[PDB]
Amino acid sequence: DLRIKEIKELLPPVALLEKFPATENAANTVAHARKAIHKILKGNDDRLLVVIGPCSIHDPVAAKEYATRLLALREELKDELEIVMRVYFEKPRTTVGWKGLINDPHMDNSFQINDGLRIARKLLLDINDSGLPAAGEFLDMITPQYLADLMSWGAIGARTTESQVHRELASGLSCPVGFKNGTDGTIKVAIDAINAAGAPHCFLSVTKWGHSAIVNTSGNGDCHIILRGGKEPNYSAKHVAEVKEGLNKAGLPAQVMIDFSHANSSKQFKKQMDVCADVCQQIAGGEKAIIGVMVESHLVEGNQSLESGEPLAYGKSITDACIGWEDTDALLRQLANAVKARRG
Amino acid sequence: DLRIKEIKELLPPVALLEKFPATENAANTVAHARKAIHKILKGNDDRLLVVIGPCSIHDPVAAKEYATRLLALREELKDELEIVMRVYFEKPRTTVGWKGLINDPHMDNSFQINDGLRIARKLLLDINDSGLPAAGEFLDMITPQYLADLMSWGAIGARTTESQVHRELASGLSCPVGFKNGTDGTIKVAIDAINAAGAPHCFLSVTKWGHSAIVNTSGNGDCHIILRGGKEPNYSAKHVAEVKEGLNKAGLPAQVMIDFSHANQFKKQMDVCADVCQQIAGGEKAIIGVMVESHLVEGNQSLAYGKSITDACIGWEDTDALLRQLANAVKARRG
Amino acid sequence: DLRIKEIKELLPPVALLEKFPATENAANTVAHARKAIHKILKGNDDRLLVVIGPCSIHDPVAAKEYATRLLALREELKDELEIVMRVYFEKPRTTVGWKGLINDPHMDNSFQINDGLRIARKLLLDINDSGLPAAGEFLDMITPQYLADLMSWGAIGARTTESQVHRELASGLSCPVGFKNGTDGTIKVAIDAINAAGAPHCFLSVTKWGHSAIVNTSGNGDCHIILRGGKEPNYSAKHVAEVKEGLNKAGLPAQVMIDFSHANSSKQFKKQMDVCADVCQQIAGGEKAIIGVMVESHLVEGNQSLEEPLAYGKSITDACIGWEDTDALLRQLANAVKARRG
Amino acid sequence: DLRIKEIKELLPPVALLEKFPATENAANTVAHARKAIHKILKGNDDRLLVVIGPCSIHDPVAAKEYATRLLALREELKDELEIVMRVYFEKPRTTVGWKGLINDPHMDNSFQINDGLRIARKLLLDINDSGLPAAGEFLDMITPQYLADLMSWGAIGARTTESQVHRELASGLSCPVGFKNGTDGTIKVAIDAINAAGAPHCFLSVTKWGHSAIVNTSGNGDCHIILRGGKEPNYSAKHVAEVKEGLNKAGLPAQVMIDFSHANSSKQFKKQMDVCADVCQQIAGGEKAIIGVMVESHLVEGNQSLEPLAYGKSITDACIGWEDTDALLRQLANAVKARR
DSSP: OOSEEEEEOOOOHHHHHHHSOOOHHHHHHHHHHHHHHHHHHTTSOOOEEEEEEOSSOOOHHHHHHHHHHHHHHHHHTTTTEEEEEEOOOOOOOSSSSOOOTTTOTTSSSOOOHHHHHHHHHHHHHHHHHTTOOEEEEOOOSSTHHHHGGGOSEEEEOTTTTTOHHHHHHHTTOSSOEEEEOOTTOOSHHHHHHHHHHHSOOEEEEEOTTSBEEEEEEOOOOOEEEEEOOSSSOOOSHHHHHHHHHHHHHTTSOOOEEEEOSGGGGTTOGGGHHHHHHHHHHHHHTTOOSEEEEEEEBOSSSBBOOSSSOSOOOTTOBSSSOBBOHHHHHHHHHHHHHHHHHHHO | OOSEEEEEEOOOHHHHHHHSOOOHHHHHHHHHHHHHHHHHHTTOOOOEEEEEEOSSOOOHHHHHHHHHHHHHHHHHTTTTEEEEEEOOOOOOOSSSSOOOTTTOTTSSSOOOHHHHHHHHHHHHHHHHHHTOOEEEEOOOSSTHHHHGGGOSEEEEOTTTTTOHHHHHHHHHOSSOEEEEOOTTOOSHHHHHHHHHHHSOOEEEEEOTTSBEEEEEEOOOOOEEEEEOOSSSOOOSHHHHHHHHHHHHHTTSOOOEEEEOSTTOOTTHHHHHHHHHHHHHHTTOOSEEEEEEEBOSSOBOOOOOTTOOSSSOBBOHHHHHHHHHHHHHHHHHHHO | OOSEEEEEEOOOHHHHHHHSOOOHHHHHHHHHHHHHHHHHHTTSOOOEEEEEEOSSOOOHHHHHHHHHHHHHHHHHTTTTEEEEEEOOOOOOOSSOSOOOTTTOTTSSSOOOHHHHHHHHHHHHHHHHHHTOOEEEEEOSSSGGGGTGGGOSEEEEOSSSTTOHHHHHHHHHOSSOEEEEOOTTSOSHHHHHHHHHHTSOEEEEEEOTTSBEEEEEEOOOSOEEEEEOOSSSOOOSHHHHHHHHHHHHHHTSOSOEEEEOSGGGGTTOGGGHHHHHHHHHHHHHTTOOSEEEEEEEBOSSOBBOOOOOOOOTTOBSSSOBBOHHHHHHHHHHHHHHHHHHTO | OTTEEEEEOOOOHHHHHHHSOOOHHHHHHHHHHHHHHHHHHHTOOOOEEEEEEOSSOOOHHHHHHHHHHHHHHHHHTTTTEEEEEEOOOOOOOSSSSOOOTTTOTTSSSOOOHHHHHHHHHHHHHHHHHTTOOEEEEOOOSSTHHHHGGGOSEEEEOGGGTTOHHHHHHHHHOSSOEEEEOOTTSOSHHHHHHHHHHTSOOEEEEEOTTSBEEEEEEOOOOOEEEEEOOSSSOOOSHHHHHHHHHHHHHTTOOOOEEEEOSGGGGTTOTTHHHHHHHHHHHHHHHTOOSEEEEEEEBOSSOBBOOOOOOOTTOBSSSOBBOHHHHHHHHHHHHHHHHHHO
């Protein structure tokens, strides 16, 4: 072990669960959102799932201010939308970079992961206790045990949709999971992933006591695809139509979540408003297959760099660029209006 | 934990290491091979690394005969080739299927992963102890702790080359590592992986004691690309030139390993060997290694002895020819 | 595994330290107290260490009211007494009924040990945050990792004083530890235990992470004898002198703590007051070896059996004295400390 | 905290059990011995149990020689005696002192407990694999998981017979256990111990994986008292009657094992030969209640202190040499023959 520089102690998940148990209302928020997404996935509800919020969490203060604003819109629009806040603690990097709040909460390569786990779970508890469900991307294999009970929906990243260990992880998650199409636009990897995840697996994992063990999962049937573009955007009716047939062809429900960001906006954050307009016209025109959308959204639009010394502006993303609150409130009302027109 | 059915006990790595310690022979085998591959990658040895063996190990018996047959050609062609056995204990699947000897040693959905780890560590030690180095595919984040000390070279599968968790594992592995290109011929995901895996990382992983912990890695500079083609073969001297440019454009050594199988019909590996031999004989010093899928008996099955139950492989006769063709192509590149 | 019926999961100590972290006030209560007992055992303080409290805790609510009352007397008599609340959770018992608060918090043989450890640590935390130092009995090797950070003083049983495993534990404890004389009143085992615990040791223990490990102790020099009788009481001046001699002969400070209960009170709770009277006479007369006293005390006197509502503030284990006798005993002990000074 | 100097890593019992597993032979040796001693404690075999061997194992070579010699008299004096060897890896000290092979195998205060466990298991494994049953004093709470599967009979020391944790340990031990009388001679403590051990207990312990857990035991019936004297010996048919009186009074089988050593030997290893005569007369006299005996025997008699040390001699309590050992075993084999 000459490439392993140092080994440090890591709190077991039981300690984080004991320090920060779920309140009654937080468990109620998680259980009700999970069930509401299941019902949307089963076709038994015509509301739209909206996973929306910052590309990454770096500030518990801005996240909770964002959560309050979003929760007010969640209550107002709840006949049309099942609104779930992006509470992403883990970021996959193209090569190297800040991996998110849990890996480095102080954002300075001190890698205080025990503190990161504490900060993240407390935040998740606070947000669920307020009544707002949370979504996360499941990237690490060990962190889920610290946080999954407060997660109402999860995503597997486009760069890990093919990874067996991530499909194994999804097959044991207690929440619904969405799988992104390939970074080049390929639909087949995600379809395979949905099927892999619907099956039981047996593999090595870590328990809530921090020990490795042999686990057996039952398969997760609440899995679905996320369209995030490839070389070109793939949100348009022609692409929805192709995905639907590909899914049916493989014996899976013909339903999609559409990500407005990333490749579907050509990496231009304000173009998420142009995807909303085409998606809203599709829904308002009667497309039932669109069961969810994803939007990268913060208090203040744009982004900033930790590298730049310029002091960090408040409520502004340090990873990908996000739309700001004004566009977020207007975007959500557009989606609600389209769900309602689809219905009448 | 609704979708979790059962949790069973798993032997800590420290246990299989105490039951099956590396002999002084195995340690020297792993060490010399790692150092030899490092020298080949620094460009201070004109020999070619040959990673050859079955697609998946399933019978320790057939596997030990192969290791003996291959050890003879190893000592014979050592002035030209650094020969390493493919001992693959973790198998990646497109959706569902057998994941290897570790996940289900009895191959019967009993998942005796504790026995699987015993059979695997014993075979690798025996192979290394004889003097034959060993190669594996690192797919799982936990199993490496049981075997990596007997590993001289490792491969990250094409499905996980873009994964941060696999790039973190590579950054701390004591063996040199090869990243395969994308299931569509892309070299960028592999160049990004080599750069990621060369940087230091901090992440969560299970220790030899079976407990989760925070690890810091130093970075792995012994990483290189593996050309496995995509929709079309990428082994020709045209594609090689493109990859070398990409690596220079990306500030990486212009060295490559060509996987003769898959995108690049088991027999076609012999044609790729000719193409590759010609490139090497012609003076291509960038092909620093190759990988071939070989077994005692050629073919595949869904049980014959020395025959693959995974991907189809070349038999031994074509393997002795492949190896001499390479050792000849090598001497041409020297004189 | 023939005689092992079931193995269940146990919360690692790190989990209870994470849920119930020491407050700054609690840590100051533990630090200051441990330091005050050290000054008394080194002859640099003339005050008496009084470990007083219930035989066992079964109700955190009555424990906290008791703690509040004792806290008031702790401050009023601080110039004469270092008052430490007895927070024990179980009565060691060949032939057994209730197995303690940690073992069986719900008093129904359900053995919700994880619940017990939670209840136990929260109680200790709350008592130390108030400013009342706490004392416990170390009976097992595993539970101390979950509570010793909030213990200012510890006792090793008389059925365990001859145990190397208990002497090893005490060698690593951060709190002063008292060893009890033999069930036969003999002081040889208690002297052997002080010498062993003052020595450095290496032994197998469980860590804060709930894993077995090799530990090395510095040895503990704040260990002392506890006189609790044998077949007959051993609190009399005759007995103290006979113990003070054996101690000096053995190279240990001639100092004792006297347990007013059990054999020294003929198993009659009210006689703890007759022992207080004899000890207060020895002290006010000048005796300086008596550094401490151990008294079994609750809100309400006597005892009760577990079966249905129970009486508040009354021991469910051994019979204790009530508050009135407790306030008077504490004032008697203080007034004697005042006289010993001259 | 302050009184903890260093915490170091410790192999879990699962690692010692995988590197040094039990051979079929070793397993049979342990299984048979346990069943035999049980039949003896049920009163279905007139034979006598003989716990014989060094006070402490400190040299696996001298130990394997002793074992070869003893395995002979076991298969010869086998119709009258059940010979089990004392393989003690851990020793109680009056205050401070070497704690045995596991705590300090190199007797240098290096405290290489991980090496000590490896050495100990391989020996016990070897001795059992040769066919010789084994015995030890269970003093540590954590070591039993590494060794107990190769133990055919155990003992709880006199200074620990009163310990709750020790009585809990015996309640779950898969082998018969003996409880030494109290250091002063008190027999009650060992009667209470026998009664606790037969009952079920729920307590905290460490698993085979080195992890603390909540364990439930089933209670152990195969427990019995060990007479070791006190301020004065307690092996006279007089005492034996007083003890059986108490055992019956407590509903306990009126059975005893006599340790011919320690305070019963007034700390002079030679008196073990004297105690043997008294005990053997009682057995020829018809005493059916003496089911076992414990003897301290090494290849070379006497004791040595802890640079180089002498072979065959104890570094702990002084023992009887092989010569006296073979004679003693044949004495016992004789008295049993008469009792029949």
